[PDB]
Amino acid sequence: SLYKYLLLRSTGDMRRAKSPTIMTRVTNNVYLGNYKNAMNAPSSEVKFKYVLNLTMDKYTLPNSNINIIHIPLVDDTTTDISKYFDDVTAFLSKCDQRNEPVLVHCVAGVNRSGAMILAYLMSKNKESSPMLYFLYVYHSMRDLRGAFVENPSFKRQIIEKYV
């Protein structure tokens, strides 16, 4: 019934894209969100230690002792993001090992952040066929969030790295 789900999703049964709303917890400590979720991170009962800001501009969070890490990524179809995969997944892995919650976000929480989260989940897959796991993670996250890594260059780079 998961095979049926993936096969229908993969042969023309995708929904129209919608903007994500609430944050999505993806692992014990790692969360995916948009700019509003980042602005709300200092007041979240999750107790974030880090925020990974993938937008083009640095910002600060006044009351907060959160450590904001800035990695500006370009959401277009020519620019490389693969040079960041290993450093980003190693940092996210460390947060999960240390139980230090981290929010990964861009502006809409679809492409730049979605791609780093997809890379992390691929990097943690030890038991499944990478092709199957990619389809499962892709379709399941898109259905949960409304839109997820719509950028086809980003999907291509993740496939080249992990599949």
UniProtKB/Swiss-Prot annotation:
Record: active site: 106
Record's note on what induces expression: Expressed in the late phase of the viral replicative cycle.
Entry annotated with the keyword Hydrolase: yes
Listed Gene3D superfamilies: Protein tyrosine phosphatase superfamily
SUPFAM superfamilies hit by this protein: (Phosphotyrosine protein) phosphatases II
Family matches, as SMART domains: DSPc, PTPc_motif
InterPro entries attached to this UniProt entry: Dual-sp_phosphatase_cat-dom, Prot-tyrosine_phosphatase-like, Tyr_Pase_AS, Tyr_Pase_cat, Tyr_Pase_dom, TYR_PHOSPHATASE_DUAL_dom
Entry keyword set: Host cytoplasm, Host-virus interaction, Hydrolase, Inhibition of host innate immune response by virus, Inhibition of host interferon signaling pathway by virus, Inhibition of host STAT1 by virus, Interferon antiviral system evasion, Late protein, Protein phosphatase, Viral immunoevasion, Virion
Root EC class: hydrolase
Family to which this protein belongs: Belongs to the protein-tyrosine phosphatase family. Non-receptor class dual specificity subfamily.
PANTHER family, sorted: DUAL SPECIFICITY PROTEIN PHOSPHATASE, DUAL SPECIFICITY PROTEIN PHOSPHATASE MPK3
Protein name: Dual specificity protein phosphatase H1
Organism (species): Variola virus
Top-level taxonomy: Viruses, Varidnaviria, Bamfordvirae, Nucleocytoviricota, Pokkesviricetes
